[PDB]
Design a protein that fits this description.
This is part of a larger assembly, with one copy of chain A, one copy of chain B, two copies of chain C, one copy of chain D and one copy of chain E.
Chain B: H1 24-42, E1 58-62, H2 69-79, E2 83-87, H3 95-101, E3 129-134, H4 148-155, E4 161-164, E5 181-184, H5 192-202, E6 207-208, H6 212-219, H7 224-234, E7 240-241, H8 246-252, H9 263-268, H10 278-281, H11 284-291, H12 298-304, E8 309-311, H13 320-341, H14 351-366, E9 368-370, H15 379-400, H16 408-423, H17 425-429, H18 435-444, H19 449-456, H20 465-468, H21 474-484
Parallel strand pairs in B: 1-4, 1-5, 2-3, 3-4, 6-7
Antiparallel strand pairs in B: 8-9
Helix pairs in contact in B: 1-2, 12-14, 13-14
Chain D: H1 7-10, H2 23-35, E1 41-45, H3 51-63, H4 67-70, E2 71-74, H5 82-93, E3 105-110, H6 117-129, E4 134-140, H7 148-152, E5 155-159, H8 164-178, H9 184-194, H10 198-212, H11 217-224, H12 228-236, H13 241-253, H14 259-271, H15 278-296, H16 302-317
Helix pairs in contact in D: 2-3, 5-6, 8-9, 9-10, 9-11, 10-11, 12-13, 12-14, 13-16, 14-15, 15-16
Chain E: H1 2-7, H2 10-13, H3 29-37, E1 44-47, H4 54-66, H5 68-74, E2 75-78, H6 86-97, H7 106-111, E3 118-122, H8 130-142, E4 147-153
Parallel strand pairs in E: 1-4, 2-3, 3-4
Classes of the chains: A alpha/beta, B alpha/beta, C mainly beta, D alpha/beta, E alpha/beta.
The structure holds phosphothiophosphoric acid-adenylate ester (AGS) (4 copies) and magnesium ion (MG) (4 copies).
PDB class: replication
Keywords: sliding clamp, DNA replication, AAA+, clamp loader, replication
Entry title: Structure of the yeast clamp loader (Replication Factor C RFC) bound to the open sliding clamp (Proliferating Cell Nuclear Antigen PCNA)
């Protein structure tokens, strides 16, 4: 009963080939030139979560060998064991033999190598270059400080830039062609801004919004549907809260904040992010306003990250904003 | 064998005791000890000699690396006609294997020694052994025989046993102090090595100015072999070592030696490096790497002796007390960081921050001149004493849980004064007739005599029982403990 | 539905003991012809392939071709829980679910019905054993095991060289080097001890000793092991069973 | 499919003269290989400057055709515990081999800084005893991780960072041997981003050549992503808080750099900030460490980095 | 079973049994209810303040999906009481995720909509180590067609 | 180039097995007359010498005398591979950096060569010129191994006493075995012979004697030579040569 439609939109729309990977054009073009010319150096993909590293490496493994890549490619992910003994036995044996299936250079894909111990990386530091004419190494990472400098220097560094807006619009258009659905321009822009580079959250919230229409073939996903599905504060309510905090007095500002955060069940952690994102564009006529505005708000965010209270932190944010916006006058 | 294939350190090795540069007194004392070893054995090592070394079966040479310890030992061994049975770190030394291989050679004679020379009578010790244990510090395969078996061997031997090591004050080497006789080979001066290097330069056809030897032995503090290797490496291309290239030679051949948990604190608390001049000669990166020599004791040492110095970096207006206050604040922050490091999630990437907060910042805040001698950390033993007392309090609490119905801490905090008043003072004010009441009140709380002894030592301040216990007569204690071992106690 | 009732019990035990510590996850493909399975190493160097027809089973009934994946450790755990005097019955429903192993004693009614939850393996079935080997040979399994576990003490690599009517096993290591040179010969009063060889081109290629030490463990099944070697091809170590065959495809080391 | 070796391995120097590293040590090793009396040597330096290549070419030139049996190379991948050092290295040192007069058996211990202290203790006398037939060559990145006694018996060879001139010379050599069109600005950018790392320089050059064909500052800065610790150093020294915030947002955040990576790089840069004084450096490091503690606890938003920069500016300005 | 519920305190007595009982989150319950008629269920991450319906709504969803018969054999539940470590996440979680979905009986196949995937609910994932959550990454991505993952937490920042 | 051929590899296997536990490295000299090899214990208490002449070799060829220094652990590892049905051949070339052991099968076309890399031993070959021992005795090897096994089980120190043409083996509870010299013509192998010049009182350790009695499989008789100021000599007779053990005495505490 397991069909292709039984997958979440995060994995249902996984790029099969390199042509279906958008955004990282500068890396994909050179990777295609690498595989066409025949010299594939040791690759180190470094990128934020949800950019296309693993999808690109699987598409490359498919395009290099064929439609059966897991047969001859060795893939070590964070789910497997990657101790020093593993590097000594398994990886070193796979690197020093020929292929059972085809006749070509083997490919060792070390996914999430930042989770490797320093001893394992030190042991791999020599085996990655002792067997070079037979096997190649691909190291995927999100944090480039866990990798030792020695291992980091032996691999061609490719940084996966976060998905730009155009690529995400292209992928949304592709999905809306592959799925009977309609998306408003303003709702699409709101989704772009909410994505924050992450390509998986786009598809996740897109499926979640397609699930809350009661008819997905005629009704279009409006901005209200997108803002309600994730519980994020709409820019209108955000601007109203900011204006009430800045201009109005304490009682009415507190009342407005409470009435806005209780009309849709918002969260202070999202209101703070929206407020700082909309406030970083102001033309503060000094350097000490921004200092307090950032310090106090970051302290409040760190305290919220521990779930202390919910009504004291709102008044804390209000007082912090007001006290910060006092050096201007 | 080829003379050209020498390592520049085997061709110039001392072939007699007159060529060991430096430590003349120590090598002479070792020679006299090995000489009168037999005369001391005749008296069963009970009587000490003129130097007080005749009451020790074994000798232990200790000192920095590269001074001639192994060479001097081998030389005094071959000189006195003995036969050398040398075991080193490459040999697997362990209690079982040591008892298997070396124990049988303690009371036996050399088999090869009989066939060396026996026609003319040169001495009566040409058929004996000198067991030279070398590099006894490395006992990774010496789980139980590293310091435990060798200590017993030093006592129960019948042949000269010479041990050679590098660090004597190591806590592992503790058993060796009170069993054998230890001698210290110090770093040699700049005269004997000067003469040796002069002869080497003469016999090697290159130029070497005598004033260079001082800086050469300076950069190589106590490592003569390192000096010989340094000369050998550079004599391949440049044949003139003078004041025109000494700077680069010295800077490129510095010794990146480690530091001990003692001089680490003295260096980090020295108020000269934190000056504007010293800040670029010993950079902050070096101050942080100083912590990485020993990240186990450095914070403890700093916390122990950060307020026992006279500061020199005090800002105008800032006094000593406020400086110690800021240093202690940073120490508390570093302790918080250290707890967050060794806690869950195994956050080890936060180590340099802990180095700055715990070690570097309080030092920089109180950097001056050491008042007296640097004190070792006291928290290490205080924590063990606290744990030992917590175990006893836990035992007493789980003995009296049947009656108290209070937490473990509130017992020590509240019940113990009343327990002292009900258990001890009846012995002082009433003599030996209050034995029954004490026995009964201990029986009601399921206490024992060991529980009473543990309770008594707990009290602090004005109420100190370890002195009052010695004021009550000695016969009533015996009567009390005898009455205890007679009556039955329902646990 | 699938019902496979064996003639004995320890047959499947000996069949599974071949890959005890050699591979972990296997996928038995059961059809009307028999049970065929293959499993790739954890390091993807050697591939085990076992085929057992309807000859070893007492009763065999397979309606549609089924594929049951399972881990070998759990399979051995289940198999050790059965006495060697009962009968083993593999039972599978219409759709592939937890395989049912059945132990029935022949004198007392003792029904041991174990269920093993299947593993979902990416069964990427290839097409092997269809390639021409430039050299083939066959020799007793005892002699091969002797040679392998005698040369494994001097090194970790073993070079096999098939030349004109000569087989050579070379072990080059640190403490020394060994070389065993055998020649093809066929005995008539003892046909099982004969060493047969058919070579078309000279062959020289190396293998690891850690994998040969696990391959020779299959010598408990048969007494005559066959070895097929070819350049740019895996080495075929085949043990012939009374009903099928168990073959290891080993990847040769790459020389500089 | 056809497969060619990368430029890193294809153009690895197999002869000691082709090394463009430190001239004094390379000439010393050349004269050693010419004479043959090679002593034990610990070669230590930054990653990617040619230590392993140096010792390998030295052993090859010293042993000629006897490299197969007269050289024992143990690296970080092979086992190097107490048992290995006591058994295999000892059995190889005592191995009787007839070599030319001025030659010796070589034991190349690579990544020696990863060996246990007990292994070095057991190796001390093994090396000291058979010095007339077996020589030892350690190659490491941190010579402080090697114990003092072991380091004493050998000659210390400290390798310095590869100067821009040497990297440029090897770059011109590779380009001339590869027939690649190049502009001087592109090569200067490659040298600037290499941070004095020959392997990284060759890798970036090969990547740029295979991606665009024409080595030019445009394509180099497109495919090279100019070094990270320099942008953070520029950010930490901004005049106003607005400039530092803009550099953090546009150059670091928008370009997809992890927050923990940013904090770690800022800490490492403040550790080696020779411009500012000691107390201000320590206070900035303390604030960066507070921010790092906040990052590791899960909350790693851009607001935390903004507050870190705000506190750093509050300290450096007052 | 009714007497046991009556004896139980009001917290467990009135625990939501269906997706219509949770009258708190109309933005998250409708997305799960529409998954019933559909078949694509994404990896869920319920996060929020203590005592808002997460642990109850996930149980109600699993019930309404599978039925009380298939519930025991189709879902794995790893809460903070169990030992969730890097070794456990590597061995047991992967073993259960890399498994074949149980065969639904005719009763369950007729009454309840049985989806072709199991469900591993890691409750209170804010207590896991960072290495365990790191190892969970490819575990919850490769076996996405036979297994889905539902995490529950009070602090979304604590999750990597 | 040396080429020696044993008619049966079992002799060399047992010869190596006899003293494989007391030493690890051994120098086999190779002259025209035969092979002589002496090896000192790692504790320098027990020496093991052996001499095998051309009478044991089916073929022997030695142009120039050469010293082969080899380890015993690796030699035993190599020897355990060969079978008791093959002929062993030791082969060495000029400047012998290695030594070849060729096992040839007489009735099968299987030839197995094993190369061993020789060791560089500081061959301080001590002369074994004869010393006039005070007591020279001989008795069966099996009974010697038995009595050493009995006395060693009680303590470690073993006292040996030769006085008034009588043998005392004592171990200090305390055990003692008394031996009288009686020559039997019916069973000549059990004839305990004893030529005494001076009373000899020596003392040895346990493990050394336990390892010497391990060699009680090549000869049915052992010869013990003793002197108060000379090491004890335990000689086993061979078909061609002899295997001797020299054990140093203990102190007179
Ligand atoms: N560049 C891209 N183009 C198209 N879809 C993408 C792209 N990047 C991510 N996606 C989508 O996001 C899914 C997950 O992307 P992955 O590449 O697996 O994430 P990742 O690069 O592995 O990052 P990690 O490993 O989770 S930190 C894919 O299956 C696609 O559906
Ligand atoms: N005082 C000395 N006079 C002359 N040569 C010396 C002296 N000390 C050491 N050497 C030389 O150093 C080499 C011997 O090293 P040793 O100093 O004996 O080693 P060590 O003292 O045991 O220190 P270790 O064991 O390596 S920590 C020979 O080349 C000697 O010539
Ligand atoms: N001085 C040099 N001249 C020419 N090529 C060099 C030089 N140094 C490094 N390389 C190149 O760097 C690659 C090999 O460098 P490595 O041996 O990995 O450096 P390394 O000194 O061993 O540092 P490690 O081992 O990674 S810590 C080859 O492609 C060499 O061509
Ligand atoms: N949305 C809801 N609708 C109805 N009853 C609810 C709801 N949320 C909580 N309850 C009641 O509160 C009880 C506990 O709910 P839970 O789902 O365990 O809360 P919670 O989200 O798990 O809090 P945690 O686990 O401490 S974060 C339920 O048994 C109900 O009686
Ligand atoms: Mg990934
Ligand atoms: Mg020494
Ligand atoms: Mg290297
Ligand atoms: Mg709950």
């Amino acid at each position: 009963k397991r069909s292709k439609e039984n997958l979440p939109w995060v994995e249902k729309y996984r790029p099969e080939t390199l042509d279906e990977v958008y955004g990282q054009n500068e890396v994909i073009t050179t990777v295609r030139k690498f595989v066409d010319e025949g010299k594939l150096p040791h690759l180190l993909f470094y990128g934020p979560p949800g950019t296309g590293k693993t999808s690109t490496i699987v598409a490359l493994a498919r395009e290099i060998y064929g439609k059966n890549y897991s047969n001859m490619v060795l893939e070590l992910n964070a789910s497997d064991d990657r101790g020093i003994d593993v590097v000594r036995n398994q990886i070193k044996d796979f690197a020093s033999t020929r292929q059972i299936f085809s006749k070509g250079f083997k490919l060792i894909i070390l996914d999430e190598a930042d989770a490797m111990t320093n001893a394992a990386q030190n042991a791999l530091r020599r085996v990655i270059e002792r067997y070079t004419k037979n096997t190649r190494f691909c190291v995927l990472a999100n944090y480039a400080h866990k990798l030792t400098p020695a291992l980091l220097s032996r691999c061609t560094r490719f940084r996966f830039q976060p998905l730009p807006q155009e690529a995400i619009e292209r992928r949304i258009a592709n999905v809306l062609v592959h799925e009977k659905l309609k998306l408003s321009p303003n709702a699409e822009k709101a989704l772009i801004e909410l994505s924050n580079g992450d390509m998986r959250r786009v598809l996740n919230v897109l499926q979640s919004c397609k699930a809350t229409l009661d008819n997905p073939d005629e009704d279009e996903i409006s901005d209200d549907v997108i803002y309600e599905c994730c519980g994020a504060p709409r820019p209108s309510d955000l601007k109203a809260v900011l204006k009430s905090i800045l201009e109005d007095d304490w009682g009415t500002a507190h009342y407005t904040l409470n009435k806005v955060r209780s009309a849709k069940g918002l969260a202070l952690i999202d209101l703070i992010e929206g407020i700082v994102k909309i406030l970083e564009d102001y033309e503060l006529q000094n350097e000490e306003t921004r200092v307090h505005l950032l310090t106090k708000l970051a302290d409040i965010e760190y305290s919220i990250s521990k779930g202390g209270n919910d009504q004291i932190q709102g008044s804390a944010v209000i007082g912090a904003i007001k006290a910060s916006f006092e050096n201007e006058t | 064998v080829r003379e050209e294939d020498k390592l520049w350190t085997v061709k110039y090795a001392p072939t007699n005791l007159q060529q060991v540069c430096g430590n003349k007194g120590s090598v002479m004392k070792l020679k006299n000890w090995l000489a009168n070893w037999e005369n001391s054995k005749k008296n069963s090592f009970k009587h000490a000699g003129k130097d007080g070394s005749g009451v020790f079966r074994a000798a232990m040479l200790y000192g920095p690396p590269g001074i001639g310890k192994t060479t001097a030992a081998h030389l005094v061994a071959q000189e006195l006609g003995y036969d050398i049975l040398e075991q080193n770190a490459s040999d697997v030394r362990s209690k079982t294997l040591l008892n298997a291989g070396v124990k049988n050679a303690l009371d036996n004679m050399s088999v090869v020694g009989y066939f060396k020379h026996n026609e003319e009578a040169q001495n009566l010790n040409g058929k004996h052994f000198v067991i030279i244990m070398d590099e006894v510090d490395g006992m990774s395969g010496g789980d139980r025989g590293g310091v435990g078996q060798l200590a017993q061997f030093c006592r129960k031997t019948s042949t000269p046993l010479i041990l050679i090591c590098n660090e004597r004050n190591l806590p592992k080497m503790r058993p060796f102090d009170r069993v054998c006789l230890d001698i210290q080979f110090r770093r040699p001066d700049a005269n004997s090595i000067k003469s040796r290097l002069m002869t080497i330069a003469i016999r090697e056809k290159f130029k070497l100015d005598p004033n260079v030897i001082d800086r050469l032995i300076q950069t190589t503090r106590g490592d003569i072999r390192q000096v010989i290797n340094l000369l050998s490496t550079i004599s391949t291309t440049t044949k003139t070592i003078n004041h025109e290239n000494i700077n680069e030679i010295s800077k490129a051949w510095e010794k990146n030696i480690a530091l001990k948990p003692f001089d680490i604190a003295h260096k980090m608390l020295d108020g000269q490096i934190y000056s504007d001049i010293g800040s670029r000669n010993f950079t902050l990166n070096d101050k942080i790497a100083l912590y990485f020599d020993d990240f186990d004791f450095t914070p403890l040492m700093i916390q122990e002796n950060y307020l026992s110095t006279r500061p020199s970096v005090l800002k105008p207006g800032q006094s000593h007390l406020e400086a110690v206050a800021e240093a202690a604040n940073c120490i508390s922050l570093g302790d918080i960081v250290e707890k967050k490091i060794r806690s869950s999630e195994q956050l080890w990437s936060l180590l340099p921050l802990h180095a700055v907060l715990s070690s570097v910042y309080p030092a920089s805040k109180v950097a001056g001149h050491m008042a007296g001698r640097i004190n070792f950390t006291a928290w290490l033993g205080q924590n063990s004493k606290s744990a030992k007392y917590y175990r006893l309090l836990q035992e007493i609490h789980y003995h009296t849980r049947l009656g108290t119905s209070t937490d473990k801490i509130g017992l020590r905090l509240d019940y113990l004064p009343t327990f002292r008043k009900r258990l001890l003072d009846p012995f002082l004010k009433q003599g030996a007739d209050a034995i029954s009441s004490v026995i009964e009140v201990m029986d009601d709380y399921y206490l024992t005599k060991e529980d009473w002894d543990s309770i008594m030592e707990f009290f602090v301040g004005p109420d100190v029982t370890t002195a009052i216990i010695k004021k009550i007569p000695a016969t009533v204690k015996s009567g009390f403990t005898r009455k205890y071992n007679s009556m039955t106690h329902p646990v | 539905m699938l019902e496979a009732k064996f003639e004995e019990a320890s047959l499947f035990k000996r069949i599974i003991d071949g890959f005890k510590d050699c591979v972990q996850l296997v996928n038995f493909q059961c059809k009307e012809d028999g049970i065929i399975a293959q499993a790739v190493d954890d390091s993807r160097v050697l591939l085990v392939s076992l085929e057992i027809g309807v000859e070893a089973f007492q009763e065999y009934r397979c309606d549609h071709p089924v594929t049951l994946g399972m881990d070998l450790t759990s399979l051995s755990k289940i198999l050790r829980c059965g006495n060697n005097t009962d009968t083993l019955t593999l039972i599978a429903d219409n759709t592939p679910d937890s395989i049912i192993l059945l132990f029935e004693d022949t004198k007392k009614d003792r029904i041991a019905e174990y269920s093993l939850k299947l593993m979902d393996i990416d069964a990427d079935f290839l097409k092997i054993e269809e390639l021409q080997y430039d050299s083939t040979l066959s020799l007793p399994s005892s002699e091969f095991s002797k040679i392998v576990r005698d040369l494994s003490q001097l090194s970790d690599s073993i070079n096999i060289m098939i030349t004109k009517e000569t087989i050579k096993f070379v072990a080059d290591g640190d403490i020394g080097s060994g070389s065993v040179i055998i020649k093809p010969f066929v005995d008539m009063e003892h046909p099982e001890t004969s060493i047969k060889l058919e070579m078309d081109q000279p062959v020289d290629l190396t293998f690891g000793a850690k994998y040969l030490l696990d391959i020779i463990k299959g010598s408990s099944l048969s007494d005559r092991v066959g070895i097929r070697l070819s350049s740019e091809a895996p080495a075929l170590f085949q043990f012939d069973l009374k009903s099928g065959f168990l073959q290891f495809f080993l990847a040769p080391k790459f020389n500089d | 499919l056809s497969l060619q070796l990368p430029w890193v391995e294809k153009y690895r120097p197999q002869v000691l003269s082709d090394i463009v590293g430190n001239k004094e040590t390379i000439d010393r090793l050349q004269q050693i290989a010419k004479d043959g009396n090679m002593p034990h040597m610990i070669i230590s330096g930054m990653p990617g400057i040619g230590k392993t290549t140096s010792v390998h070419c030295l052993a090859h030139e010293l042993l000629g055709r006897s490299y197969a049996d007269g050289v024992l190379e143990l690296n970080a991948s092979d086992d190097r515990g107490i048992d290995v050092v006591r058994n295999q290295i000892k059995h190889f040192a005592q191995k009787k081999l007839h070599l030319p007069p001025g030659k010796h058996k070589i034991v190349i211990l690579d990544e020696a800084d990863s060996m246990t202290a007990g292994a070095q203790q057991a190796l001390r006398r093994t090396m000291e005893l058979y010095s007339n037939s077996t020589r030892f060559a350690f190659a490491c990145n941190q010579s402080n991780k090697i114990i003092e006694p072991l380091q004493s018996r050998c000659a210390i060879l400290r390798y310095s960072k590869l100067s821009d001139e040497d990297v440029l010379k090897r770059l011109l050599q590779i380009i001339k041997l590869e027939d690649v069109k190049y502009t001087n600005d592109g090569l200067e950018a490659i040298i600037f981003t290499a941070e004095g790392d020959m392997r990284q320089a060759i890798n970036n050059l090969q990547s740029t050549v295979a991606g665009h064909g024409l080595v030019n500052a445009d394509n180099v800065f497109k495919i090279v992503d100019s070094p990270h610790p320099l942008i953070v150093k520029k950010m930490l020294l901004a005049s106003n808080l607005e400039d530092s915030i803009q550099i953090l947002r546009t150059d670091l955040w928008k370009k997809g750099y992890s927050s923990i990576d940013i904090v770690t790089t800022s800490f490492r840069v403040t550790k080696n900030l020779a411009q500012v004084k000691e107390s201000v450096r320590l206070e900035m490091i303390k604030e960066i460490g507070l921010t790092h503690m906040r990052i590791l606890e899960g909350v790693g938003t851009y607001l935390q980095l903004a507050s870190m920069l705000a506190k750093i500016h509050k300290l450096n300005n007052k | 079973a009714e007497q046991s519920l009556a004896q139980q305190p009001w917290v467990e007595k009135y625990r939501p049994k269906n997706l219509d009982e949770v009258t708190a989150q109309d933005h998250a319950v409708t997305v799960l209810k529409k998954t019933l008629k559909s078949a694509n269920l994404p990896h869920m991450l319920f996060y929020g303040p203590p005592g808002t319906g997460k642990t109850s709504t996930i149980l109600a969803l699993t019930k309404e999906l599978y039925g009380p018969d298939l519930m025991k054999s189709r879902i794995l539940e790893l809460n903070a009481s169990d030992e969730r470590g890097i070794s456990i996440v590597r061995e047991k979680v992967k073993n259960f995720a890399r498994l074949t979905v149980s065969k639904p009986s005719k009763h369950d196949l007729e009454n309840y909509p049985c989806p072709p995937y199991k469900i591993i609910i890691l409750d209170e994932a804010d207590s896991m180590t960072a290495d365990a959550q790191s190892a969970l990454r490819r575990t919850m991505e490769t076996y996405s067609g036979v297994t889905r993952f539902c995490l529950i937490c009070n602090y979304v920042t604590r999750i990597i």
